[model samples]
Target: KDIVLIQSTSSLSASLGDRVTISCRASQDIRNYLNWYQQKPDGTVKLLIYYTSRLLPGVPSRFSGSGSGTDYSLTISNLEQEDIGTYFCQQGNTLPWTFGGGTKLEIRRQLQQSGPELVKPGASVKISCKDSGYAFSSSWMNWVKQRPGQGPEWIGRIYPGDGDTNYNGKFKGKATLTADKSSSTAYMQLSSLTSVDSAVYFCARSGLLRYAMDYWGQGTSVTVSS
Candidate 1:
């Protein structure tokens, strides 16, 4: 319940054919379960490495992962324009698997626009989780809501392309979960927002278990005021 990624590579830059390395240092030993994923600009997700060095089937030859104990690294050999995006590291050996903050691989291109930072109280709010790429559509998408100085609290989740959802009791009737398979985007809507509803919201992917969120979006912070 206390697993944490202590440190991570913030960002990296490389050109075509150049190799680059990114790292994640965990607070506890999670050797075999260290996993790496890529988040494309379109918000799709890709599994790059799993169980340490073994590349996920269909992952490009340029991607690899290695290390043990608390130190782990994900490398991209012969980086290409297609590889320009954000990368994340995570651990699934424990009950509550955690993902490293993030590492963005940058190229010469336009930057990704951000989400709304504020919402007026009493208005409805809808946050999005768009996972980019294949093989990820089957996994569940979860929305984590958190207030300042507090840990993440699970709201609810919906599987790919499906409208069916499982809620966290605390979210029942308060949050609505939905997904759009046509665009590979999942959604969470909070209605009648109050000051207490203002918080950072995160979109995460489920692991082997229904509740294990192994990979997460960079997070969208929202505040309700006025």
Candidate 2:
């Protein structure tokens, strides 16, 4: 079965204390099963709205959500400097929950990952994610894999500060993570590639929440051929 598709504006530019609105539309009716999340540059994830329009506890009063069926929106009133992060809309109406493309608040800080690389079975390929803005060493960077027709699955996370890492067991021996602080970049090396490894890979800023991915890089497509 195909997952529901979502649409969102790629990026937006605004100033502090300004009013901003981000919208997400689902390809199917999802009722009130929408949630809004905020991801800060520091790799922190915060739930802003839930069940369509209910503001979560502890979220600032300036944040709100509205809409129904397949169309929903997250609105920020008097945006603050701390609100300078990416906002995501997620649908919980069904299995294989999906997220919108994401709305970046401003400033163009990016996690630029490299890929669309072609490779052969039994070969190794390494992809890079360059950080443009933010302190690269302040938080953990995560790697995720999205096989064709599947939702994203977490592979592992690496801390740039000390080169420490945590793998998801499934990818332990197949993937490696490393970062070069001087270049503000992170790398993932995939080995023993097969058709199974032919998928899109993403690099994300790790969030304070154990499994939360704050900001995601534009995915890198890896095709394995004979």
Candidate 3:
């Protein structure tokens, strides 16, 4: 996918109840087609504002968005403990789409996702994320891909409850998701690997919303070669 060129601060630190603004700038006019998403410590992502400033249903009013053309901002007023996480800005104006580098709202977190880095085309690799501190059996886990210099892409999510799963149509046949409740771990297996599949893979916990990725696992590097 084309990495839509966008700019955003890498991180921000603020006290609870304080007001803060996260900025994003595009290289060209993208109208008001920008959207904002929040990634929480639990590995879930939630849409906060869409179409510029329209708050999503049930999103706190204190969290707002504003901008037009190439520049935009996500402002959080009276930030709470729940506000600690990462915020990303995305644009829909471009055909391939693109996402900002993301702004971490300070607080803290991490998960362990591990796998081999050098993979051969036509060969398969299984990546895993070990779970701890949370109820592994009751939650859903997601797999995300990040190409070099590109924003993350949502591959799919697996419900550990029963191994039910969902995926982005583009990755339907390329990726496989599974979980082992007995081991408190989740996994993603990539088949028919190619150069395009060379990227960092991440496994995350589902957020408050079904598609939201709350807590995330540290990425596993997979470089499909020769």
Candidate 4:
């Protein structure tokens, strides 16, 4: 017998402070077996929604979810600055867990001076990297964010080969990072777009099973303004 997997899809450009929802589907009936999670700077994983329509214990009531058969939804009410991040929908009933391509939620405000700066050699810079592969074999990519007065913050890292990601506990509600080995690319997103969010962001590859950041990308500096 062959099993059909319903691949995950996503939406983007969601305005900050507004309710947003992500949906996932299974090729075949998988009942109410699913889970949702959020990754934040500092390296911690927060289980938000799980078991189809059931919310994980301790999850804020503002985060509500529902689903049936092979379809499911995860919603956040009154998105806040801390709520700015990437959201993912996952299915656990299958052999290898699957995740949605993530939608980055950002504030719709425009920045007058917001621009990116590329780092040069001989200069210290931060980088971010992501890999797209199976949910179990892709490389783990890491993310770092710098604020105006605050130092660099570790958001999280994802293993694109296996769709596994870890985040900083303190970063929850602040940032989100992910990778796609298939595209050989990774992503890092910072929200709230205030002058405080200005800093260099980087994507880099980490050692297998270890948290040491090895391969790195040219740093990108983001200055927030308007």
Candidate 5:
């Protein structure tokens, strides 16, 4: 409910065989009195890592955590598919308590250059959509996020001419959308790597339907490894 800015990534990317590490930096010392929780899209939340480094009693062995003082981190070794979601780090070692800004764990995928990213997990990559035919800002430029076995997620769209941008409600805080008028390119940045993010990312021009993509750039394939 009420928490301070704990400064963690808004998203993440990773894979089955990979190990994903998420860090939370605190403003003050909280010692080893930390706890971690996962909040899913389905409205279910659970404690995965606790006591600084031990997996909760009912949690699987793949997830673990560690750290003390002003720095703390959570690591998932032998990552699992169901482990995908958003995480929060909290410290109850003081008078009241403090919580880190929530961090999301998504599938991993890398852009040509950029930052978990959400979906699964990955090293940072940045992918760009460049337009040569039309004025970069003539129409709305959009970045589309898609995953296998899942539907499409319209991350965000931008107007390059004026440097104006808009993001889907789902990605409001999770995705960073940008536009470059000079180069006529659109950019997206995501962090907190996970496995579901290793899908295809496409740049599309808004058409017929407000959300439909009538024109699109060649699909970009993004992957990850341990």
Candidate 6:
């Protein structure tokens, strides 16, 4: 099957504490239906805006959004360190929903400055997990992360299904896991790496009865640097 995806490019780069706008157009009449997401390195993707201009529940009001029809825009009134990642637009008008390629909005940082430390692929690392939908301890969850300049990589996964487990051998001994049934959250950490740990981190949850991650947290980014 072929899916047609549409996206817009932001010609501006945002600095910390600056306001920024990301806009996109749909090839068809998407009505006033759209959702926005933010992706961070080594972290999870966060839902900032959804259902046209409505901000996602719990999203800061400072992140205002407005638009309709084929054109829509998400504006961050006061960008913060947490906002320095990528922005994506999605349409809920139809099934097999599509997402924009994503706009990278980051704060310029130097290696000499404070930043996330990198983990080697073969080394051990730790990550935390949290969930909001359904009951916490009763649902299944999975963790995944993406390396810089690369697509998403599935690390190890934990299933509440009989508490069974599976892992990518390449990630064996490098990733650890712990979950808080009370908090409905799961965590993953990767250890050892040969420049493979310099990527974004993410925590995701498996759908009710599917292996696909339908809910994701805003990703955290880590760079492999000295």
Q: Output the number of the TM-score-best candidate.
A: 3
Clashes of 6: 36
> What local lDDT does model 1 show for residue 90?
67
Q: What TM-score, over all chains together, does every model reach?
A: 0.60, 0.56, 0.61, 0.43, 0.45, 0.52
Model 6, residue 136: what's the lDDT?
47
Assess each prediction's global lDDT (C-alpha) against the native. 0.72, 0.77, 0.76, 0.54, 0.63, 0.61
Tell me which of candidates 1 and 4 scores higher on lDDT.
1
Q: For each candidate, how many residue pairs have backbone atoms clashing (under 3 Å)?
A: 4, 0, 11, 29, 55, 36
* Deviation of model 5 at 154, angstroms: 32
lDDT of 6: 0.61
Model 3 off-target regions past 4 Å? Answer: 1-72, 75-87, 90-110
Candidate 3 lDDT by residue in tens digits, 1-226: 4435455577778777788898988877778878787877754566678778888788999988888888899898888898988888877575434578877788433357775579778889988898884667777787778775456777878888799987877898999999888888888889989999998787867545444444667678899887
Candidate 3 structure, TM-score to reference: 0.61
Task: For model 4, state the Cα shift of residue 78 in Å.
Answer: 1.3
State the lDDT of candidate 1 residue by residue for 55-168, as single tens digits. Answer: 766888888888999899988877888898777776766644466777778864400113857778788877787777563567878777756534346677787755667776
Decoy 1 TM-score against native: 0.60
RMSD per candidate (Å) reads: 6.8, 9.4, 7.4, 14.0, 16.0, 8.1
Which is the better candidate, 1 or 3, if ranked by lDDT? 3
lDDT string, candidate 4, 121-218, tens digits = 22322234433323223455666554432323446677666667777665555566654455566666555455555566655454542333334444
lDDT of 6 by residue, 97-171 (tens): 455666787775500111355654455555565665664455546555565433345565666434555665556
Model 2, which residues run further than 4 Å from truth?
Answer: 1-109
Model 2 alpha-carbon miss at residue 120, Å: 0.8
